[PDB]
């Protein structure tokens, strides 16, 4: 996260660290959506252009974390992957359309003060909150700037941006399964996600039931916190049918 702040203890209890076994390194962010299911971006596991193709045994998910590097004894839980499920129509060839993946845990993770699942929106949650100008929250252990690493989980609140401004910011072909967020140059304020933040969640707090919903997933952008550029996020509601399908049948 660029131009964000240190999160508070337990401010993002759904926050998941995708961790690489050997060499031990951060792979990506992710979110906890039940005691057995974790959500992230498909590119965190599959990205042929870079020779990225991880399977279950290549990694661990680390939940309840706050500090990036430390092993948070008696706080985090480290879970093993039983199975990875990547969106069949995920488009890594052109524009990362449908950048989303599900990961099933081998055993259930126990909830606690620091570990809790976020909600997924339904049609009305989406429609009532996916509005230009409404701010969401993005959290992550990624790069502090485009071109070091933070000691603790970082957070930034960013306004959702109108579709045409999103399109007019980039040469890339934008789909219905994405949205962009970030301040305009003229708004003065700053902030974006960056490398290492990938797969983490974009959440919003509904003013109706006061619950946090994950509306987006960190997926891509041109540089980080670049003037006139915006972060692009996977539209989680637009792909809800697929999340239910996978949950339903496995």
């Amino acid at each position: 996260i660029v131009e964000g702040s240190d999160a508070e203890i337990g401010m993002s209890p759904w926050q998941v660290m995708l961790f690489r076994k050997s060499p031990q390194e951060l792979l990506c962010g992710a979110s906890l959506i039940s005691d057995r299911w974790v959500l992230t971006a498909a590119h965190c596991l599959l990205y042929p252009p870079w020779d990225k193709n991880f399977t279950e045994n290549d990694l661990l998910v680390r939940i309840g974390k706050h500090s990036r590097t430390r092993y948070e004894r008696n706080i985090e839980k480290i879970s093993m992957l039983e199975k990875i499920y990547i969106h069949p129509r995920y488009n890594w060839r052109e524009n990362l359309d449908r950048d989303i993946a599900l990961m099933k845990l081998k055993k259930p993770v126990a909830f606690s003060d620091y570990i809790h699942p976020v909600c997924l929106p339904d049609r009305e949650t989406a429609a009532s909150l996916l509005q230009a100008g409404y701010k969401g929250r993005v959290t992550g252990w990624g790069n502090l700037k485009e071109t070091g690493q933070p000691s603790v989980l970082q957070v930034v609140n960013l306004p959702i941006v109108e579709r045409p401004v999103c399109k007019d910011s980039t040469r890339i072909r934008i789909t219905d399964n994405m949205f962009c967020a970030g301040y305009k140059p003229d708004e003065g304020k700053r902030g974006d996600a960056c490398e290492g933040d990938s797969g983490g969640p974009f959440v919003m707090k509904s003013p109706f039931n006061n619950r946090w919903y994950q509306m987006g997933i960190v997926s891509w952008g041109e540089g980080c916190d670049r003037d006139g550029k915006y972060g692009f996020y996977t539209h989680v509601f637009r792909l809800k049918k697929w999340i239910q399908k996978v949950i339903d049948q496995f």
């Binding site: 076994k21 031990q24 390194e25 951060l26 661990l60 590097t69 430390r70 092993y71 480290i78 093993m80």
Partner: peptide, 10 residues
């Protein structure tokens, strides 16, 4: 730099 995690996590 990442701190070693317990062995049972492999």
């Amino acid at each position: 730099d990442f701190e070693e995690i317990p062995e049972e996590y492999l």
